[PDB]
Amino acid sequence: MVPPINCIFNFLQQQTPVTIWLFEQIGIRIKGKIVGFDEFMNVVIDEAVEIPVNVEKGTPLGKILLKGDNITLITSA
Amino acid sequence: MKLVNFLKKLRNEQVTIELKNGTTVWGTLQSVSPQMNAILTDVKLTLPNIASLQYINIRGNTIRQIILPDSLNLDSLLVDQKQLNSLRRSANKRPRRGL
Amino acid sequence: LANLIDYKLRVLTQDGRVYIGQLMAFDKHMNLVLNECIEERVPKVEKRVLGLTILRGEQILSTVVEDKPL
Amino acid sequence: YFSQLKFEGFALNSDIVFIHQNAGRLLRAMFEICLKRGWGHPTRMLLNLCKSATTKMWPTNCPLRQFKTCPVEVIKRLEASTVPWGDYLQLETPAEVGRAIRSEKYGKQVYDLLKRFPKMSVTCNAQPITRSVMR
Amino acid sequence: FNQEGDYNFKYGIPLEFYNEMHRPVHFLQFSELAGD
Amino acid sequence: PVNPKPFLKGLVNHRVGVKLKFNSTEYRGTLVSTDNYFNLQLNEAEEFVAGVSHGTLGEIFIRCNNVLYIREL
Amino acid sequence: ELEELEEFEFKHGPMSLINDAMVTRTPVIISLRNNHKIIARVKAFDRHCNMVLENVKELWTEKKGKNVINRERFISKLFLRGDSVIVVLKTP
Amino acid sequence: LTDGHLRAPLKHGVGILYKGMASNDERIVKRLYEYGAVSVLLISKDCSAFACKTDEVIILGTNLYDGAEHKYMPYTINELLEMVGLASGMAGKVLILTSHNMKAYYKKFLIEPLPTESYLQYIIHDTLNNEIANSIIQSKQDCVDWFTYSYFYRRIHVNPSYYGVRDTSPHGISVFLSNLVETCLNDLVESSFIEIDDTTEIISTLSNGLIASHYGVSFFTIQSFVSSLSNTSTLKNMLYVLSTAVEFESVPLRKGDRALLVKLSKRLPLRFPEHTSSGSVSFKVFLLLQAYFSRLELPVDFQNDLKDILEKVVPLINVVVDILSANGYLNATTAMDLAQMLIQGVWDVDNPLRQIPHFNNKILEKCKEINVETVYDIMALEDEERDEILTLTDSQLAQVAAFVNNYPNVELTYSLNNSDSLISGVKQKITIQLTRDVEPENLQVTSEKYPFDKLESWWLVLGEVSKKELYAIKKVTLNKETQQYELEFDTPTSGKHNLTIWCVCDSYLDADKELSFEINVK
Amino acid sequence: VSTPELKKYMDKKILLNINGSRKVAGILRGYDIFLNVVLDDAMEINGEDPANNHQLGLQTVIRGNSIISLEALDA
Amino acid sequence: NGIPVKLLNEAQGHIVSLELTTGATYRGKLVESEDSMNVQLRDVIATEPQGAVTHMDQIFVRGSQIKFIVVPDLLKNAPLFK
RNA sequence: CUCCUCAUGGUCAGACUAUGUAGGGAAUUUUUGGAAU
């Protein structure tokens, strides 16, 4: 029963792989480790991968700054 | 500075506003709000077959662009707010001059 | 917008639906309250009597003078 | 016309329309003529008259009337208060202006408008260049 | 008017005994003649 | 904490590419500067649409709001 | 002081492209959200990327019952909203 | 076709004449007039000094605008005199187009002689400062006896009503005059120019009055500098302080200069402080200094104003750096850099290469091609490489050569009396040996954008960086090739003290030669 | 900034419907001024028949700006 | 605050209808309305754009997602006529 | 022109209202767009 920013912070410490659902896009979702974030929920994500669902393939992207506006649902995998 | 003030200058001007939805508007600006909400009169309006309307108020965020007359003096209209800011901001030896 | 008060007005929504009603009040966000408001879709066809409605300013496209106040 | 009198019998009102259109003209002419002549008694009074044709009021009606935003009750109160204009102009504290105009409301507005009314701290130092010419 | 009371003074041109500044009551009575 | 703003500052003066939300456009170029609201300026920019090179644009400005993400290349 | 910092940040930031456009009176091309493009000279700008553009040539793409065709028109005095801007490109 | 519009008017028989023109073009106009090719010539006011003998003269308008006054003001009868000397016949003809208010003034004082008066009463503060600095006036009695020599004195006697002395009599004169000089002295002691103590009476001079009086800068300007300048001040603030002065009253503006200043401000490195007035000549001075640092293509109207400013600034900037030295702030370094920028016309960080006369973008790139950073590398270069870099005319090449030659590679060395015995709060003399590459034939400074001639000088600087404290400074004119100079400077408090010496030229940028050394004081 | 009064929904199983016709079910855990929500025992209901347990105890965060609406399964 | 916000706060305790950005219509008793237009609703009958209708006990929808509300006619009397 | 903030003068027991050389109306619930096809 914890604020979402604290939840993101425990993702930060645990360094668990994170799956982000983007906004109005079911086709692709982004994945990788949270190395840091800001007040606007922009996330620096390491070893990130694009995951088109449409068996799943993906593109390795390396280090990424993802803008928080895309964020629909942050998760752990 | 703020271009919305430049729009405020545009009262009684005949313009054609293209909108984000694609709608074309043609009319004389009665006023524009600072929101860039534009109230116009004698407006022919074409949704993407023209409808003729006495008065039309448009929400500013819907405005894509506004095409102004070519006769407009942009040099004169653009420089205002700086002068207004300067106005808001604003010994013996006085006469360098003599007799 | 204050002159338009109490008038019958036609508001065009974001989705293209056309609402018509008396404009009783507004606010900063351009949220409008419309008395005895009815909805028209295609142009009468598909007309419905909604009654007293608020409309959001984020959804509103434009408003025009429809008729005089009651 | 200076006192703002509209009329029922409109013969008078037609004549006063004529005076409305040509009055400030004629008066302004007389003023310029006296100014060319170099006459002191007429020129000041004529200038006041010209001002009265322009702005449609008397001296005893307060200059707050020619503000578009100044309300009616306030100007009535000042007209009836029998107070020199210089004192109101010298008043600074806004609350103190509201107390002076004896209505607490609108006082701040009135003071704002006062600082929008012309006020001049004026000084002059004369000095002779030679015996005839004086700068 | 106050027979013993303080007043500030200045240089200037004095007005007529019957002059517009000295007769303010007359203007309110003059416009009050027609009223409103 | 390593924030997006410091990571981006360290990313300045390096070859980057930016994928917009539309994915209709990606931009690969040197990252000249970024402002506090995160608008992007690139130089020698190249446009990749559908993963193929569309053309070489040059000095380019990217509206912040369109940016999906930025990655270093 | 705050005003100074804002103007400076604007000068050395990404905004420098539209600043450079106004000072040099150079043409820039703007990819918009309507899938239309505006190549013009920047008369004025704003933090929102609201712009007064002169000598506007807008280019667009249209589809018909045969091969896709490009269409274009000239608008001498154009004022533009700030949100329609996808991209502002400066080039030779 | 210089003076971009002088062609079309002159082609139809009306010539144009104004200050700031291309000189050749002006001369062509004048020749046409003398030969009769142009029967009509339109001369701007400031060119009354250029006397073109005419058969007839017309004077159109008696009113010229200055921004500082914020209204048109009529011409001086002096200007009109210089404007009527040009015309002589078959019969001398002078048309003067005037107002009714100014008719009686010109119609009298042109035909009848000019009554002469004295404005000293305005400048008395500065003048008396100067006298005290020269120490001719030891006391107030001495000053009154000094005012006995004034044309002012005679004048106040013949026409006392003009100067505001009501009593007309020997005693009245004496009293009024002593009043004036007393007021003057209070302003000076309050502003720290002097000090007055009872034992007739003793007056002494402080560091402020020294420099102010020596450079001749007016009292009010100095007081303004004092009020604004403090420690930890920036270069922008120093430049503003420079711009606010009374010396710039003589820089004219009509409405266009100010509006164009607004339009120009987009293109400039700095931004005027918000709490002062834009219309004031200070803002214009500020922007024209900006346009001097960045070489903009200026209108020929603004070139003249830039020239005037430059004629004023060198004393002013000297005062700015020295007053900070007197207040013992190590930030005088930045003032020195600004002075260098004024002598040359380039910024410190922007590029050292642009300092060398007549460099532009393309030519600078070749310097990046040969990977040169400082100017000292240009001295080691040989002729073939120089020819490759600059392809240009011969006069410009010559000035560059002279620049390179008189710009010395000078070395900074010190010799301290005792490094072991270091006592706190004692006057510690150092002997700094300075040595120059080439011994000068003459000290002339060469710069294109600073038309007036300058002799080179140097400042020796000692201070500690973290505390922002400047311990010692001295100015030197180095005529010889090698010299020694003794800085008598009090030592800091006990402990370890970093002492960094700069050798900074007043003229040339990127000449900064530094040596850092630390001493332990007891 | 106002805080939504979600305290009545705390520790209750809810069905969030979200942009893109997405629907998830989970116990309400946290929230903030931003309406951003933490859900525990999160279960994605995909378009057809299956549901996946994404976060059983590891929970999840949903952006309040992406939250369309929230149904209370309990009372 | 907004005058329509003030009315909408008066609408609490009444039966209102809500259309969201998706187009689904929720009719029910309005429990609570925040300043941000977030609304808590009871005993809701829901009509989808496809025409299917469902019943739900407690629903809470974000302000930003609401296209519009319809409130009972009782409130039209006052005090918003001024 | 409108809403907010701030300042203010007043009134009531924080709210309301007039005025303002004021600040503002691009980072999640409204006006600087997730829209485009």
Curated annotation (Swiss-Prot), chain B:
Q: Residue ranges of the Sm domain?
A: 2-72
List the subcellular locations.
Nucleus; Cytoplasm
Q: Which domain of life is it from?
A: Eukaryota
Q: Name one GO biological process term.
A: mRNA 5'-splice site recognition
Q: Which UniProt keywords apply?
A: Cytoplasm, mRNA processing, mRNA splicing, Nucleus, Ribonucleoprotein, RNA-binding
The disulfides recorded in the entry are: none
User: What Gene3D superfamilies is this protein classified in?
Assistant: 2.30.30.100
Coarsely, its chief localization is: nucleus
- What terms describe the molecular function in GO for this protein? mRNA binding; RNA binding
Q: Which GO terms describe its cellular component?
A: catalytic step 2 spliceosome; commitment complex; cytoplasm; cytosol; nucleus; pICln-Sm protein complex; precatalytic spliceosome; Prp19 complex
Query: What subunit structure does UniProt give?
Result: Component of the Sm core complex, present in spliceosomal snRNP U1, U2, U4/U6 and U5. The core complex contains SMB1, SMD1, SMD2, SMD3, SME1, SMX3 and SMX2 (Sm proteins B, D1, D2, D3, E, F and G, respectively), and is probably a heptameric ring structure.
Chain's role = lays a role in pre-mRNA splicing as a core component of the spliceosomal U1, U2, U4 and U5 small nuclear ribonucleoproteins (snRNPs), the building blocks of the spliceosome. Also binds telomerase RNA and is required for its accumulation.
Domain topic, free-text comment: C-terminal extension may function as a nuclear localization signal (NLS).
What PANTHER family is this protein classified in?
A: SMALL NUCLEAR RIBONUCLEOPROTEIN SM
The misc remark on file is:
Present with 2400 molecules/cell in log phase SD medium.
Q: What is this protein called?
A: Small nuclear ribonucleoprotein Sm D1
Q: Which organism is it from?
A: Saccharomyces cerevisiae (strain ATCC 204508 / S288c)
- Gene, per the UniProt record: SMD1
From Swiss-Prot, chain C:
- UniProt domain comment: C-terminal extension may function as a nuclear localization signal (NLS).
The lineage's top-level taxon is Eukaryota
> What protein family is recorded?
Belongs to the snRNP SmB/SmN family.
Q: State the function annotated in the UniProt record.
A: Plays a role in pre-mRNA splicing as a core component of the spliceosomal U1, U2, U4 and U5 small nuclear ribonucleoproteins (snRNPs), the building blocks of the spliceosome.
Protein name per UniProt: Small nuclear ribonucleoprotein-associated protein B
Q: What other note does the entry give for this protein?
A: Present with 861 molecules/cell in log phase SD medium.
UniProt organism field: Saccharomyces cerevisiae (strain ATCC 204508 / S288c)
- Which portion of the complete protein is shown here? 12 to 102 of 196
- Complexes and interactors: Component of the Sm core complex, present in spliceosomal snRNP U1, U2, U4/U6 and U5. The core complex contains SMB1, SMD1, SMD2, SMD3, SME1, SMX3 and SMX2 (Sm proteins B, D1, D2, D3, E, F and G, respectively), and is probably a heptameric ring structure. SMB1 specifically interacts with SMD3.
Q: Where would you find this protein in the cell?
A: Nucleus; Cytoplasm
Which intervals hold domain Sm? 1-69
Swiss-Prot record, chain E:
Source organism, top-level taxon: Eukaryota
Q: Where in the cell is the protein located?
A: Nucleus
What functional role does this protein have?
Functions as a scaffold that mediates the ordered assembly of spliceosomal proteins and snRNAs. Required for association of BRR2 with the spliceosomal U5 snRNP, and the subsequent assembly of the U4/U6-U5 tri-snRNP complex. Functions as a scaffold that positions spliceosomal U2, U5 and U6 snRNAs at splice sites on pre-mRNA substrates, so that splicing can occur. Interacts with both the 5' and the 3' splice site, as well as the branch region. Has a role in branch site-3' splice site selection. Associates with the branch site-3' splice 3'-exon region. Also has a role in cell cycle.
| Misc. comment | Present with 468 molecules/cell in log phase SD medium.
Under the subunit heading, UniProt states: Component of the U4/U6-U5 tri-snRNP complex composed of the U4, U6 and U5 snRNAs and at least PRP3, PRP4, PRP6, PRP8, PRP18, PRP31, PRP38, SNU13, SNU23, SNU66, SNU114, SPP381, SMB1, SMD1, SMD2, SMD3, SMX2, SMX3, LSM2, LSM3, LSM4, LSM5, LSM6, LSM7, LSM8, BRR2 and DIB1.
Q: What's the protein called, per UniProt?
A: Pre-mRNA-splicing factor 8
List the source organism.
Answer: Saccharomyces cerevisiae (strain ATCC 204508 / S288c)
**Full-length numbering of the shown residues:** 2366 to 2401 of 2413
Swiss-Prot record, chain G:
Write one Gene Ontology MF term.
RNA binding
Location in or out of the cell? Nucleus; Cytoplasm, Cytosol
- Which cysteines in this chain are paired by disulphide bridges? none
Swiss-Prot/TrEMBL GO biological process terms:
7-methylguanosine cap hypermethylation; mRNA 5'-splice site recognition; mRNA splicing, via spliceosome; spliceosomal complex assembly; spliceosomal snRNP assembly; U2-type prespliceosome assembly
Q: Which domain of life is it from?
A: Eukaryota
Predominant localisation class: nucleus
Query: Which intervals hold domain Sm?
Result: 15-92
Query: Which of UniProt's keywords are assigned here?
Result: Cytoplasm, mRNA processing, mRNA splicing, Nucleus, Ribonucleoprotein, RNA-binding
Question: Keyword Cytoplasm on this protein?
Answer: yes
GO cellular-component terms in the record?
Answer: catalytic step 2 spliceosome; commitment complex; cytoplasm; cytosol; nucleus; pICln-Sm protein complex; precatalytic spliceosome; Prp19 complex
Which positions are tagged coiled coil?
none
Q: Family assignment?
A: Belongs to the snRNP core protein family.
Give any extra note attached to this record: Present with 799 molecules/cell in log phase SD medium.
- Give the record's subunit note: Component of the Sm core complex, present in spliceosomal snRNP U1, U2, U4/U6 and U5. The core complex contains SMB1, SMD1, SMD2, SMD3, SME1, SMX3 and SMX2 (Sm proteins B, D1, D2, D3, E, F and G, respectively), and is probably a heptameric ring structure.
Q: What does this protein do?
A: Plays a role in pre-mRNA splicing as a core component of the spliceosomal U1, U2, U4 and U5 small nuclear ribonucleoproteins (snRNPs), the building blocks of the spliceosome.
Instruction: Name it.
Output: Small nuclear ribonucleoprotein Sm D2
Q: Which organism is it from?
A: Saccharomyces cerevisiae (strain ATCC 204508 / S288c) (Baker's yeast)
Portion held of the full protein:
17 to 108 of 110
